[PDB]
């Protein structure tokens, strides 16, 4: 607290030692040779080679350059949560980038540099290679993702091809024994749950199986000023509409609030004849994006209805009570048994969502919008499965659970997106080729020159694809001849690489390394606008108002 | 907390301080001659000789220091935890191994180091020397492992030579004599005991002895989930098979929550017919690895059961109520009486377990994975002793319990896996036979010289394998003729060292001095891991987060 | 908090001024011309010359050099527990003998060192003049141990006299008038007491006195599990062996929680028509070392029980009431009337107490086995006796009640074991002794000579057994003449001293000045045993974990 407002020469000089030291740190993590580092928390110490938790428990002592760290971590960290390994390349493009920006300064020449990596992008997004649950680089992928996990990718990638059809969806625990052990189902993860304990079997938030229901799918929250409605709705099914309805009925919406909550519990004690068992014959569902609720409508055959006050208007034309078997539960829903006129109405809805994606834009493809409609299609077609996962002590069982979800998270989002070949070569392909695209293309040769080439940027930012492969390889087998690496048209057609593994020199292709393509582009992205970021970054500010 | 992130060259520096300084305290504690060390705690002096209590308690005031330090003592503090007296040696490796590491840089000198030290471990490991209770060596490994108690080995060792045939289970407790005072049994520990206090006679969690019982093993958790299927199950067990049934009715389990316990309580008021002088006929027996239920199955003919539901469907050819005699208890039960009938069930159900130890692999033969297969061979096959431990005060008292647990851990582990010749021999005989197996070898000595020998580490790891050796004898008779010392052919042939007791020189298998093989063996496994990963670290974070 | 380990030249430099330090304070009290020390606490001043004063209340600022003082200090402190005026000799010799070991460092020269420290014990251990009752040297002792206390020393060799043959237990309370007055009983000093105020007459912690009893002696602690075999052995005394039965019952044991309590005050309860005059029935009875406990069985001609459900399975051979006389108490009971039926078994198990000591090795005598042996037999053959301590003030009344105390623990281990001359002399004589008996052998010479004559040792001991003579005697009219003093053949076979109460020269048998054997001993014994720790400690630890 000697001073608050850090403005130009000072500011900059921060966010370049903070940005040094963030990038020293977390690339020495990266790959199956990487170095390690030591983590504190209070009285123990997690030794670890993982570049998310590197990154994400960095620390500075300075409020200011904390402030800069968050700025670097945050964007990495944000990588994985949604991705599968893939934050240490954010970082190390970061540091390139920001680099490069300072390096052409002049914001005429800002804007330039943009533009250039933003074809970089859509060349990354071109290359992506496609790939079936049948494919044998699936566990390629795997095993790249698991820092070699002989044992483990070859589980994930047979679970995900022996469902040749349906994408399966994994969950965790911590298991008991040393050998791992799965549990199969033909059950969808559904995203609805219990309003209130009460209305479980037993009246205490227990899991209530049930062979037979009439669901129906609300749109609004509902709170204190819909419960008149509700009092109208549910005496109007069970007093005229009782004959085509079989119990118990679900009432799914967004939100129940404890004033609704209260008035369905009075009208489950109105009618006790329908009381089979202790069962309550009315439960309402909640929910934590409104297309989701259609999927749900849809799963369960409801009818989708926007206010509370439609439930009155209705007739069998639009009511239809399922005779399956579903699981309400206190975290999630689970429907096992679904007939084949019921399927057929799902994978109609299915494909619906994905002709959507079949139409989208290349770079709309690896856009959030269409991450969130792939994950629809998972609910929708994907049978459930639970994997016990064991070890010699409890450490390291839940070390190996992590390794895990983050081989899922990969696989999940390869076959989602794309594939690239690894050993960061894809990356000085694409520059490469950026470069010679708009440079061979005579239209526009004239500017694409005098922009980039006789400027210089784009001799800089081939050098910068670079980074990751010498971060690998040099002070190895295949930098030690020559002096450094001649990146020639040689290379460029067949790309040599090292497996860190074994040894063996080869192709990426060959040895089998390969990145996750939304990995390899969601750092390149991120590493540009946070570089940018930095780079365009004047003025700190520390005070607590 | 000046700096919360130490790169580089200052992180490897204060990785050297800390162990370099945790070495010349720890192993200035190494043998009987040893040198001592005050700890505080509180008010009080612990003066100790004993090196586990020594890395245990040893603190660092930076934070920093104090994160390597854990990585080093944490090993040390492991090995002893389930083997027995050896945890200098781990540390003394740690030193010397990761001296060795930066002395040859470049990661595939690293790979190379590993490579030579894993197959020096293979010989230690078909060094190991097998041994059983009859054998006058098994002395010899506890007055090695006891620091010369002519008193103490002697008794131990008896104990294990009397029961020629079973092993024994040996527990300790506070004697109040001068005198040790010896209590033995023709009993089984088992690793059960009572959900609630309520099930014991009297009501209290007393000690209930049983002359015949009923048993039955589920191996799920039990919770307010399966309230509903004990009723059902209970119910079916006294209604229906009534007449093959020797009460009490066992329920052994993984766990029992609050809510069975109570719901079990009320079915045994329900019988009150059934209920003889207080006891009541069911039990709930809980246990904090599904293999070991298995056992306790075995060991009472009572039927193993994944689910709860099972309970119902059931005959006289699963049910088996046994006429024997079981103690129950709060912290554990124990069997007692067993019929000639009911022992070649057990017998069978333990050779079993033995015929998959016998083809395992010579490093299985080490894992976690088979000590935990023979922990379950004791508890099925082996009688059950108490030693009320005596002493001139109440600190002799306590002091000589440890030394009791020492001894007892290392003949278990003696037998079990093997005996090694003490006095840092085994560790000089390993080496410099793994240097000479590879190089008198013609078929593979073109590379095995390229790698190890004409680097130069070959010749590094064998000064190395001397620190033991030297470590106890320099500064004594042995090491005043000829400077130094000679470790030429003659002395691998026949390798002399001095009883630091007596003082006398001779063989290590002349002299008496064993150590365990499970010691020194996970020692140097255990300084491999831990010397890479000190010398594999180049970032230290000290952020709470 | 700068450093929490201290290693080699910095460990061994603070326990050197440690030990110098505490040596400077507690050697100046020696003696009556010792020299004064003033002690704080609080707002008041204790001025003192008594050196287990002195060492006890010595604080040092750091935590490291206090680290040191409590292993300087609780060895001479426990001293004065068991014995009884011989601390600051212990210190003394802490300090020599850590000086010696120091001057010949090499641990062959350590073990040199202690084996023949170890052998003028030994000659100590025959010096031992054996002195009964009737002997003028116990007053010569008690005047020693009084500081020459005319009146005191007067009293208490007469009141061991006058009883001469029955060994006095003595106990003090402050009294009221100028002179002291003594209380004589026929009475013996029982150590059991109640485990509740409940059980007492009244029914809040009074004395009952009991004019017969039917006593029990159980040897495991009571707690919460063993609620139910109370309640079977107790109505199963009283309603089969109520004809054989005196009242009350007494269940003496180990310790008695507060679970077990509550259940025996209902048994109290259950049977009203047994309660004479309030005095409850059933009392239990706690002892804060099993064989006290069969004093206590034999005293009381109770059976011994290892079992608790043992009180089930009895008879009248087992079962014996006695009509004594008993007075229960809070801190202690008491037996007063005996019949000699029952002094009879009391007298033979006294014996064969004896007959074991009888026939222990000398150095066996002086162990702590053999002490506690001792107490054993004053508990049972032993007159009580309470002397009230009177003076002028109050402070004087507890000042000589502490002087009081230390007299009788001095005759009681002089008679025990035996007496020696005082005035630093015995040592001078032993050491000068065991260094002539080896050397003069003919048998041994040859390696005696090498060990410790011609390495040095031995005249390094010599000298230093002179410390306790010239601190008493340097700046005297003794050391006046002839520079230092000449400890010549002449002076060996008749020392010289000096009475410093009187200011007379002569022998110390001459002048009446002897100290305790055991006291002199144990401060060589354990004077070794700290130096020896001292002097082989390198290594300091401070930190609470
Ligand atoms: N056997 C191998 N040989 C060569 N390169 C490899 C091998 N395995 C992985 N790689 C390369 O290492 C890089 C991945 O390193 P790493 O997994 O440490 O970074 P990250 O995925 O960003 O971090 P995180 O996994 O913590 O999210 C990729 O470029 C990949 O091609
Ligand atoms: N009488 C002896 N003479 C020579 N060497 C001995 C003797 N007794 C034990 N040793 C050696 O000393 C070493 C054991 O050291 P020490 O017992 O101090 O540490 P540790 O067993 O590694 O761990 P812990 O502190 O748990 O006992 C072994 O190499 C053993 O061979
Ligand atoms: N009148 C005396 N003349 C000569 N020496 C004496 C006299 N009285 C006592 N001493 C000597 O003083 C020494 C006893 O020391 P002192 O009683 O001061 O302390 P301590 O017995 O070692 O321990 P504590 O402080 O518990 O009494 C003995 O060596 C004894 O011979
Ligand atoms: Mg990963
Ligand atoms: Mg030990
Ligand atoms: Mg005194």
Same mark, same amino acid.
């Given at each position: 607290?000697?001073?608050?407002?850090?403005?130009? /020469?000072?500011?900059?000089?921060?966010?370049?030692?903070?940005?040094?030291?963030?990038?020293?740190?977390?690339?020495?993590?990266?790959?199956?040779?990487?170095?390690?580092?030591?983590?504190?928390?209070?009285?123990?110490?997690?030794?670890?080679?993982?570049?998310?938790? =590197?990154?994400?428990?960095?620390?500075?002592?300075?409020?200011?350059?904390?402030?800069?760290?968050?700025?670097?971590?945050?964007? $990495?960290?944000?990588?994985?949560?949604?991705?599968?390994?893939?934050?240490?390349?954010?970082?190390?493009?970061?540091?390139?980038?920001?680099?490069?920006?300072?390096?052409?300064?002049?914001?005429?020449?800002? !804007?330039?540099?943009?533009?250039? =990596?933003?074809?970089?992008?859509?060349?990354?997004?071109?290359?992506?290679?496609?790939?079936?649950?049948?494919?044998?680089?699936?566990?390629?992928?795997?095993?790249?993702?698991?820092?070699?996990?002989?044992?483990?990718?070859?589980?994930?990638?047979?679970?995900?091809?022996?469902?040749?059809?349906?994408?399966?969806?994994?969950?965790?625990?911590?298991?008991?024994?040393?050998?791992?052990?799965?549990?199969?189902?033909?059950?969808?993860?559904?995203?609805?749950?219990? $309003?209130?304990? %009460?209305?479980?079997?037993?009246?205490?938030?227990?899991?209530?199986?049930?062979?037979?229901?009439?669901?129906?799918?609300?749109?609004? !929250?509902?709170?204190?000023?819909?419960?008149?409605?509700?009092?109208?709705?549910?005496?109007?099914?069970?007093?005229?509409?009782?004959?085509?309805?079989?119990?118990?009925?679900?009432?799914?919406?967004?939100?129940?609030?404890?004033?609704?909550?209260?008035?369905?519990?009075?009208?489950?004690?109105?009618?006790?004849?329908?009381?089979?068992?202790?069962?309550? %014959?009315?439960?309402?569902?909640?929910?934590?994006?409104?297309?989701?609720?259609?999927?749900?409508?849809?799963?369960?055959?409801?009818?989708?209805?926007?206010?509370?006050?439609?439930?009155?208007?209705?007739?069998?034309?639009?009511?239809?009570?399922?005779?399956?078997?579903?699981?309400?539960?206190?975290?999630?829903?689970?429907? /096992?048994?679904?007939?084949? #006129?019921?399927?057929?109405?799902?994978?109609?809805?299915?494909?619906?969502?994905?002709?959507?994606?079949?139409?989208?834009?290349?770079?709309?493809?690896?856009?959030?919008?269409?991450?969130?409609?792939?994950?629809?299609?998972?609910? +929708?077609?994907?049978?459930?499965?639970?994997?016990?996962?064991?070890?010699?002590?409890?450490?390291?069982?839940?070390?190996?659970?992590?390794?895990?979800?983050?081989?899922?998270?990969?696989?999940?989002?390869? +076959?989602?997106?794309?594939?690239?070949?690894?050993?960061?070569?894809?990356?000085?392909?694409?520059?490469?080729?950026?470069?010679?695209?708009?440079?061979?293309? #005579?239209?526009?040769?004239?500017?694409?020159? /005098?922009?980039?080439?006789?400027?210089?940027? $784009?001799?800089?930012?081939?050098?910068?694809?670079?980074?990751?492969?010498?971060?690998?390889?040099?002070?190895?087998?295949?930098?030690?001849?020559?002096?450094?690496?001649?990146?020639?048209?040689? %290379?460029?057609?067949?790309?040599?690489?090292?497996?860190?593994?074994?040894?063996?020199?080869?192709?990426?292709?060959?040895?089998?390394?390969?990145?996750?393509?939304?990995?390899?582009?969601?750092?390149?992205?991120?590493?540009?606008?946070?570089?940018?970021?930095?780079?365009?970054?004047?003025?700190?500010?520390?005070?607590? #108002?």
């Amino acid at each position: 607290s000697q001073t608050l407002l850090v403005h130009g /020469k000072d500011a900059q000089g921060i966010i370049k030692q903070v940005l040094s030291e963030v990038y020293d740190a977390v690339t020495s993590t990266m790959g199956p040779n990487g170095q390690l580092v030591m983590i504190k928390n209070g009285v123990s110490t997690k030794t670890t080679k993982d570049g998310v938790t =590197v990154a994400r428990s960095i620390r500075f002592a300075d409020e200011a350059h904390e402030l800069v760290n968050r700025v670097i971590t945050e964007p $990495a960290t944000k990588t994985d949560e949604e991705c599968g390994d893939g934050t240490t390349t954010t970082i190390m493009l970061t540091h390139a980038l920001y680099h490069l920006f300072k390096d052409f300064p002049g914001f005429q020449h800002h !804007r330039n540099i943009e533009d250039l =990596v933003e074809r970089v992008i859509q060349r990354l997004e071109s290359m992506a290679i496609r790939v079936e649950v049948d494919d044998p680089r699936l566990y390629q992928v795997a095993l790249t993702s698991s820092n070699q996990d002989e044992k483990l990718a070859r589980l994930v990638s047979e679970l995900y091809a022996n469902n040749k059809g349906s994408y399966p969806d994994i969950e965790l625990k911590e298991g008991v024994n040393f050998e791992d052990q799965i549990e199969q189902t033909t059950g969808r993860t559904i995203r609805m749950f219990y $309003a209130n304990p %009460w209305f479980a079997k037993g009246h205490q938030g227990g899991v209530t199986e049930l062979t037979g229901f009439t669901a129906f799918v609300i749109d609004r !929250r509902i709170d204190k000023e819909d419960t008149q409605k509700l009092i109208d709705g549910v005496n109007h099914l069970v007093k005229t509409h009782k004959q085509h309805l079989a119990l118990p009925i679900l009432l799914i919406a967004r939100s129940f609030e404890e004033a609704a909550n209260s008035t369905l519990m009075q009208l489950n004690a109105a009618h006790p004849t329908l009381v089979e068992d202790g069962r309550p %014959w009315l439960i309402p569902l909640s929910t934590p994006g409104t297309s989701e609720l259609q999927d749900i409508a849809v799963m369960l055959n409801a009818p989708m209805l926007s206010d509370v006050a439609d439930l009155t208007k209705l007739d069998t034309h639009s009511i239809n009570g399922q005779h399956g078997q579903l699981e309400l539960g206190g975290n999630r829903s689970i429907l /096992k048994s679904t007939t084949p #006129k019921d399927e057929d109405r799902i994978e109609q809805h299915a494909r619906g969502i994905e002709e959507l994606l079949e139409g989208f834009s290349l770079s709309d493809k690896f856009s959030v919008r269409a991450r969130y409609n792939e994950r629809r299609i998972r609910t +929708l077609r994907g049978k459930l499965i639970t994997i016990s996962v064991g070890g010699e002590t409890y450490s390291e069982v839940k070390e190996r659970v992590d390794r895990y979800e983050d081989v899922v998270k990969a696989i999940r989002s390869a +076959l989602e997106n794309g594939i690239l070949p690894g050993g960061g070569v894809s990356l000085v392909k694409a520059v490469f080729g950026t470069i010679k695209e708009g440079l061979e293309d #005579k239209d526009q040769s004239a500017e694409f020159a /005098k922009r980039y080439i006789n400027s210089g940027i $784009a001799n800089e930012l081939m050098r910068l694809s670079t980074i990751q492969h010498k971060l690998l390889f040099k002070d190895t087998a295949l930098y030690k001849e020559n002096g450094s690496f001649h990146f020639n048209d040689d %290379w460029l057609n067949t790309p040599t690489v090292m497996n860190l593994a074994t040894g063996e020199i080869g192709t990426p292709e060959g040895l089998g390394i390969y990145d996750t393509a939304y990995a390899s582009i969601t750092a390149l992205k991120g590493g540009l606008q946070t570089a940018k970021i930095l780079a365009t970054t004047k003025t700190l500010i520390l005070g607590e #108002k």
